[PDB]
Design a protein around this ligand. Structure first.
Ligand SMILES: Cc1ncc(COP(=O)(O)O)c(/C=N/[C@@H]2[C@@H](O)[C@@H](OP(=O)(O)OP(=O)(O)OC[C@H]3O[C@@H](n4cc(C)c(=O)[nH]c4=O)C[C@@H]3O)O[C@H](C)[C@H]2O)c1O
Ligand SMILES: Cc1ncc(COP(=O)(O)O)c(/C=N/[C@@H]2[C@@H](O)[C@@H](OP(=O)(O)OP(=O)(O)OC[C@H]3O[C@@H](n4cc(C)c(=O)[nH]c4=O)C[C@@H]3O)O[C@H](C)[C@H]2O)c1O
Ligand SMILES: [Cl-]
Ligand code: NA
Lengths: 362, 361
């Protein structure tokens, strides 16, 4: 009777018979890499997102690295990016020897404040990486206009936001290219590492396929210096099984999130009231007594994880960014904690979380 | 047709254990960095006779991460065979190091140790040896050069799982080793897979971190790392098959001996095994290579070339295209790989040799 932050066994148990059937199918095929399962999943995910092309790759960090690589930007080219995202977003930029330009989020969305972007555009700016953090779509309209004004690419980091909708389009189809994680804890999660890239652009999709296959378009030839970043047939099959339920799963997460938003009332806690569509990958509360809170919940047998306690600019791997004054970002990092949420989470369990938080006197 | 490498035949031996372990993983609810990875790494370490194994995502990553971990300066030089698979070279260029390409010995298909020293400079930091097609490289002189010049030895073991040199396995012949477990490798996964082996405690720890976003500890990033991990599922399939690896290699040894004792065609140069050879690939050499591939295909025998375009001649490496590497070039024009796999049937290998003997040009 410890309540786990995210019980993947529970989430995945509904599909066990299907997983096994597809695994046996793959065994029958004797094809485990770049086969029918990958094609099939790609086609179905591209349809889900409303895009022309989907390329399965190895994980969500590789998805962003590849996208950036394929644009073939110059050394020290600038990519604008929220300061409060998960570090992988920044790793993708610096791996490619681009310079990240870190922008404060809006305190009431946790996503990049669009009104703070233009002042930081320079003649070296080549792209804006938006991140739909925690499951909430970014307010894209201003960002798309800005990108057009200054001839910049929009790269969406969709790792946290599978299926969210801005006005008339899905996340994934709000920019020039989109990277997804299908890490097992994602809203659409694999049974292993996995990711993809989405795009409408024919040439970019062909370049990405090559770049993810050693740089080889054609057996024996390497047009580019590429890398090995592929989505295994088995993970593709698992993903495709689960994709048929993703809209349903997300709406169920919405139901749970709305219960929390409506039932948790504590002067010590700021709830993540959404300003745009939110698929609630993470249900993030904010409190001045965050470490006290995590211990309190642990004492009542409720497991929590912080997303996140150290922001990228303050990591030891980025000592050249440590000086940056980003107080909204820093404050968020000091105050946030994520509460358990999943599409299969039991009523007793979410009822318990709300009740226990309401009783909390700090 | 006869397939070049029939992975269904190779993997069928293990279906019931694969499905059992798959179900075990499902029951565990854990798919990344769990007990299956730990177990496989511990066993593969024991198998190579090394202290540490780090499961990573594929053989290129394995090499990229070893070089990344050394923290070489831009344009630092890495000595490497000119005739290896391009991924060996990609690992070096990805790290902004300069590949210094050395001709192989025609009698080994491996880097000629006698051609190394003359290419060492103040910028040389490493030698990447490749144990090509399954044969261990003649390390005696390479180790002496590495000691003399304070160079790292990086082994690319993607084609030579389990090969032996003196008292040691490939993987334990240098500072650090990368392996592929791509499904066609002598130990193959059902998906992309790799590992790194080393004896150095600090380096092993650094590699773990660098392959997990640069994080040693949850929430913290010491290094600007990558995501390159060996899935639980794959680790489990690997560990099931590892118990049969020496047996599988010996089955290859048998087929290669059949070929060697039975193919007698003046148009074909057969491979030799000067040192231990696990025969990942059984590479013949002819001036009429395209002709032979087509002839074999007419006779329902599938073959692949390893390889027909060398790294320096590739479009991606335009700045290398002018390099004069005639031994490597001639090998690329003339080599063809024959079907060999541990489960290959007697009638199939007999047919390959009979058909080669009948090739009359
Ligand atoms: C904005 C953004 N961009 C790019 C990326 C990069 O994508 P990637 O390369 O695919 O990681 C991320 C990754 N983002 C996530 C990141 O948010 C973080 O998430 P986390 O919630 O801290 O992850 P976790 O604690 O490992 O797992 C969450 C829960 O799930 C349980 N679990 C987990 C596993 C693996 C299991 O097998 N069984 C379980 O029961 C344990 C936990 O309760 O770390 C991950 C490793 C990244 O993939 C991102 O947020
Ligand atoms: C020295 C050296 N260093 C680093 C590396 C990099 O390692 P990596 O990143 O793990 O690839 C290699 C890779 N080396 C190999 C390289 O030699 C080459 O091998 P190849 O024999 O041309 O490979 P292939 O034709 O894709 O597969 C071989 C046969 O297996 C059949 N098959 C294959 C698959 C995937 C399947 O699912 N089912 C099948 O039935 C088809 C073919 O008949 O290309 C591969 C992609 C690399 O992993 C190397 O040789
Ligand atoms: Cl004929
Ligand atoms: Na993988």
């Amino acid at each position: 009777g410890h309540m786990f932050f995210l019980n993947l066994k529970q989430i995945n148990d509904r599909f066990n018979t299907e997983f096994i059937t597809k695994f046996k199918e793959i065994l029958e095929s004797g094809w485990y890499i770049l086969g029918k399962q990958c094609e099939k999943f790609e086609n179905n995910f591209a349809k889900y997102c409303g895009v022309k092309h989907c390329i399965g790759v190895a994980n969500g960090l590789d998805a962003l690295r590849l996208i950036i690589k394929a644009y073939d930007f110059k050394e020290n080219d600038e990519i604008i990016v929220p300061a409060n995202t998960y570090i992988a977003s920044i790793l993708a930029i610096t791996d490619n020897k681009c310079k990240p330009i870190l922008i404060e989020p809006d305190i009431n969305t946790y996503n990049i404040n669009p009104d703070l972007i233009e002042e930081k555009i320079t003649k070296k700016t080549k792209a804006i990486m938006v991140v739909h953090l925690y499951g909430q779509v970014c307010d894209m309209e201003k960002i798309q206009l800005l990108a057009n004004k200054y001839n910049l690419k929009i790269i969406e980091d969709c790792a946290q936001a599978h299926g969210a909708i801005y006005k008339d389009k899905r996340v994934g189809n709000l920019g020039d290219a989109a990277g997804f994680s299908f890490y097992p804890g994602a809203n659409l999660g694999a049974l292993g590492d996995a990711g993809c890239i989405c795009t409408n652009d024919d040439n970019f999709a062909s370049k990405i396929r090559a770049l993810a296959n050693y740089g080889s378009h054609k057996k024996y030839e390497n047009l580019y210096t590429g890398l090995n970043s592929r989505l295994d047939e088995i993970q593709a099959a698992f993903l495709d099984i689960k994709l048929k339920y993703l809209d349903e799963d997300n709406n169920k997460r919405k139901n749970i999130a709305n219960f929390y938003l409506q039932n948790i009332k504590n002067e010590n806690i700021i709830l993540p009231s959404n300003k745009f569509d939110h698929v609630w990958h993470l249900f993030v509360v904010k409190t001045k007594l965050r470490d006290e809170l995590q211990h309190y919940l642990n004492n009542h047998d409720i497991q929590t994880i912080i997303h996140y306690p150290i922001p990228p600019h303050k990591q030891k791997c980025y000592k050249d960014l440590n000086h940056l004054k980003l107080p909204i970002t820093e404050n968020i990092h000091q105050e946030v904690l994520s509460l358990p949420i999943s599409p299969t989470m039991k009523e007793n369990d979410f009822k318990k979380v709300a009740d226990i938080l309401n009783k909390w006197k700090v």
